[PDB]
Amino acid sequence: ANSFLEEVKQGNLERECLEEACSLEEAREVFEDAEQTDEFWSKYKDGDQCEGHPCLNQGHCKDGIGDYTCTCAEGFEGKNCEFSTR
Numbered sequence: 578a579n580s581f582l583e584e585v586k587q588g589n590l591e592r593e594c595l596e597e598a599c600s601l602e603e604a605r606e607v608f609e610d611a612e613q614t615d616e617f618w619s620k621y622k623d624g625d626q627c628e629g630h631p632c633l634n635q636g637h638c639k640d641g642i643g644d645y646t647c648t649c650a651e652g653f654e655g656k657n658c659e660f661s662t663r
Contacts, residue, residue, distance in 0.1 A: 578602060591617065591625035591640050617642055634658035 581603070588599060588607030599607075601618070610617050620642045627640035632647030636658035639646040649655075652663030 591621065591642065592627060592638075595625045595628060613641070632657050634661040 581598075585603050585607070588594065588603045590604070590608055590610070590613075594600065594604040604617075605614070623642065625640045626642060626645030627638040630638075631645060632638045632649075633655070634653045634657070635650050636653060637648035639648065647657055649658030652661065654660035654662050
């Protein structure tokens with residue numbers, strides 16, 4: 578397959594290649610992901626877990642299949658930082 582890969586403008590984990598950006602051709606060997614090779618795959622098909630904006634109140638988001646993670650700022654609260662204390 579010769580396309581954006583011939584010159585991978587840039588390969589990210591599951592957050593950037595969440596769409597047609599990549600899937601296995603470019604998102605493989607681009608990261609030290611040794612176990613993510615499998616873990617990353619097999620249990621993915623979830624939008625990457627960050628798709629949908631699980632975090633809230635200016636909360637960041639650390640994906641990685643096997644579920645994801647979020648990040649509330651200083652003055653935030655709730656699972657998705659929903660309760661912006663400030």
